[model samples]
Target: ATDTGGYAATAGGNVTGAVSKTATSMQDIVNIIDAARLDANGKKVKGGAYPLVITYTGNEDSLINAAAANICGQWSKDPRGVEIKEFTKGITIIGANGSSANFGIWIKKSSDVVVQNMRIGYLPGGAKDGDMIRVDDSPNVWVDHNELFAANHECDGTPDNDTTFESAVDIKGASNTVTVSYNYIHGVKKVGLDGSSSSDTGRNITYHHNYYNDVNAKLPLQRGGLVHAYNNLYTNITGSGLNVRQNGQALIENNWFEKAINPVTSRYDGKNFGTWVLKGNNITKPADFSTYSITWTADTKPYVNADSWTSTGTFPTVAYNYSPVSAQCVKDKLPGYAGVGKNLATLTSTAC
Candidate 1:
């Protein structure tokens, strides 16, 4: 699903004829996200759709108090705790019989939502607690085959308490063609944070076949976001990897970084930095991509205006930038890639 910014993400939650709700607890899934429809700055008010599809039952603290189940969390913050914000346009949040549940803190300010096969472990306090999933200022979203761990260090790398957990998945307040695929993100030392090095512009994301265990760096850390990370499979990383810094615009392709330490690079500080285009990676432990503390003004070609639309996909008339392909096939050569926890369904197969 490389670069799926055209927004047709592998068909997450097909939901055709609409109107189907299946929630058991978590206050009946907070009464179908408090019956979608919001405005007055809360966003979630465009064209107006919401052909709902939710599903759930009672586990993982299901919605603290939840105002006895009417419309909690959002009276500025925890009048009871239900702040889902909005989601009417083609919504779908399945998982209960498939049993791999967990909840608390999931706020996609509204667009077309679909969070399939669930598991998030923490988030029931108020104001969407601390983020198990949050795609702020939403767009056509798709977060597939989930298993987001962190019930105080589930898969371990760091996560027993990071100010009460954050980052199970976070595509900040400018969210766009979000398409984080075949999930299994682990630990919780910051794993995925597209757009928010301090600004807006959350562009077309598309991390495919994921399974990053023992996290440490933003297997996704794109700030001014615009990514396309490919064929994933990282294990036990300690520090940096696939981080296309502040002014963000990435393209680290054909991934398989095992033992991760120097998985891929690019970072900025004095203000901002962006542009990365490394190709066919496969590191076992390589870090030191030659240097840099805060220097990278721009020029790895992080989207200039390839196909217009600017944020969340479209921009590939050419310009993957070029220059870092002196190698290929490394971590035993990945060959496809998909998802479901461990082996990741044979890495499911991709080529973008």
Candidate 2:
């Protein structure tokens, strides 16, 4: 079970002395983490005294909808999340059956974290950094079997006039290695960001077996370093997908893209555009564009599109071991295995 694919090979609180805790509310999760920083003798320990396996048993989707409906109130309340800050002893946050959350899980300056089987939706107070899962200054993180979603519309006069809902999973700030798999991300304006800024980059991240639907852009706007994307299903991508920028390199393979615009491209920045090596995708050539329902932009802005059906640049060899199913298998069967439930199942070549 510890063999999480890609560059991130973390056991995530599955080590010895990892205590189990149940959280019935958001505050309970925070309190449990606070208590975890102390040893059994009540002595404070640095980087957390012991590892933890926290199970969230809350259902707050209705409350989240109520808060989201009132944008002003939501913003006034500010961001809501279970902050796992500087707790480096490792942890795993999993949602029980029929559980949900209105907020997010923000891991900062930590490592060896895992989040699974959680349904997070309609988060409130999203004007700034209200990501469903935010990994900052952390490494060896795995986000799997979670459903993240929000309405893909912006309210008028919001902060910067473009902050409606934030990203689903945003990784940034020295998070060296991470893996995002078996996630169902939909109805989101910004899917995620590999790096927060143009200068903030460097990491080997892996995104696989994720189902993206009705999203606007940023199927992770890669900033730099390397990313391996495979066995993902991208559908109804209204804007761009995988906006690799800042000299980032990506290996995109064995994935399906349908009704997507700029599925693999380096955009936003005219100069220092990143590159991607494409392989085994459903749309191998421009001739298959019509069959795959791929679209291109006519924007006057500077951008690089992979419409040539050729590798824009070379990518280094992936370090981890994984066997991706065919793109056809991902397109035909991803939804059944990409989200919460289904027992956190993973699709292998044998399944295809």
Candidate 3:
């Protein structure tokens, strides 16, 4: 997942049905993904195909005003996978305002794939719901160079069910070996939900070189697994950022935080992070990050002071050999080039 973006041939041969095309519209792009699901006989490929590259001929707007539910990529299993990328163009639009748990792009039970160079969700003055990408039970997935934003959900005004979406990304169930990098994830709640349980413990995920801008909560609510967040920038957070909840462990490293009310609030879902780990992290005027735990407080839930908690675990290294993007430079340099709708390749890797 972390290193396995998609599959290729054993002898470096051609993929089964890999095709190259110049797309005209959004539906054309959708049809290509659908094509991978079928085999030589047009029967449904079991666990799906692999080792293909979907190279778009040009950039185009989806204009996909209405989809039945979410624009989805299903079960492309095994072999290190398809490359949904553009050497130069971009998928300019992905939107909807009308469903719950009805995501924009749902990738579930799929493995060995790379989804890159795209944009999803709505801007501030809009209504959007659900998540943009939900990766469930998938392995060997690399999600990169995408802009995922869920419009602000009434932080100052009356709450409206019709006008707000959840987070930008969710990796739930037994999802493992995943890396989400070089992306812009902002303007949402639950910015990143690593796992769904306190003891499930299967998500081995990495989030790096991404911009977590102005999120409300759960910059990532880490639980039931292991996560590493490195070289990312978190700015203007409201409630909190990077919650290491449940019995999960997070290896936060070389990250930069600015204007976050609370940069790291570990263990609120069950206060068991006397085992959280931190290293090489950079925070500017960091705020208090509180962690709540259970300790036989009679019949009520038990929360603890930040002083009582002890984060003694060491940070992990080399999950796909990820290197921190360098917190020494200004954060504006990285975040400003985040959501380049016309071209993601336009972002040159240079210090601020």
Candidate 4:
């Protein structure tokens, strides 16, 4: 019916013709998302479900690499029971003119997905380990209010991208109840929310109120288990905002860390195992180095045992009102201190 162009749904119960000639490539949106699979013939119509919606109103940089190589080839050829909704009204997935293997939106085996208010940028080149929104072994996912920009301008002096471990949001293995909210990730070279996994375990994750700027590397490197990093805003990060390797029951709260270069570290190259809860956070340093502040040597470790966990309320107070250029250098390089106030209206005025 509505023929301005593009629309189809037919196979016994028909509904077609609205073809205005576009779809420059990503296999023409992975053959139009595997022909709008609700079951693509597996025959699970109604409640079994198959509701697809991919809308892009032309001049999307002329079909950005066939729409990011057909949305990574329809999630590498249907990773599971699919449910996709990609609406790129604000498109900028560059490659070859903007150059660098043209990446922006690439997912693998996507599950219950929802990517809203898009603004994904010139995804740095290929095989430097890709990510501008990469969810592997996908689970119930939701990446909201997007704006990720990282074109790999040669490792901005190391936060990541020592070549290509690129991340703006890269979740790997046993990806559990994932939810990365209110996004506004900055020109990253590496790590801005990278939940790692070798033996499959990344549990109930949630990162709220996001806004990370000039991050060079290491924002989040949680190994596994009930992880919840709250209230984000990290500026001018050079290293360690949260890199707790091994594993734990992490619930680091009310985040706002500024001008960090190296502090947060739980080192797990040998893989230990779990428990971390650094309550109500707001770690600010770099007040002219604060006598060489590693935020007091990375929040003085001891999350699990060392009395189990509880740095009692209110600790971090080195306020400079965040100005690495109006804040967001990865919330001025946060690496654990503790929380209270000094911006964001005195850190939400106490209340986790």
* TM-score against native, each model: 0.29, 0.96, 0.69, 0.30
Highest-TM-score candidate: 2
Candidate 1 has an lDDT of 0.54
lDDT of each: 0.54, 0.88, 0.52, 0.45
Any runs in candidate 1 off by more than 4 Å, and if so which? 1-11, 25-52, 62-91, 94-113, 116-119, 122-141, 144-147, 151-178, 181-186, 189-205, 208-214, 217-237, 243-352
Model 1 CA lDDT for position 116:
63
Instruction: Summarize candidate 1's per-residue lDDT along 44-73 as a digit string, tens digits.
Output: 655334466666644543432342242222
Cα RMSD, each candidate? 18.6, 1.5, 9.1, 19.7
Score residue 111 of candidate 4 by CA lDDT.
Answer: 53
Candidate 3 local lDDT, 216-244, one digit each (tens): 77757777567777777777677667776
Ranking by lDDT: 2, 1, 3, 4
Q: Which is better, 2 or 3, measured by lDDT?
A: 2
Compare candidates 2 and 4 on TM-score and give the better one.
2
Which candidate number would show the highest lDDT if scored against the true structure? 2
lDDT by residue (tens digit), candidate 2, 236-309: 99989998899999999999999988888777777788999999999889999899889888556688898897
- List residue ranges in candidate 2 displaced over 4 A: 67-77
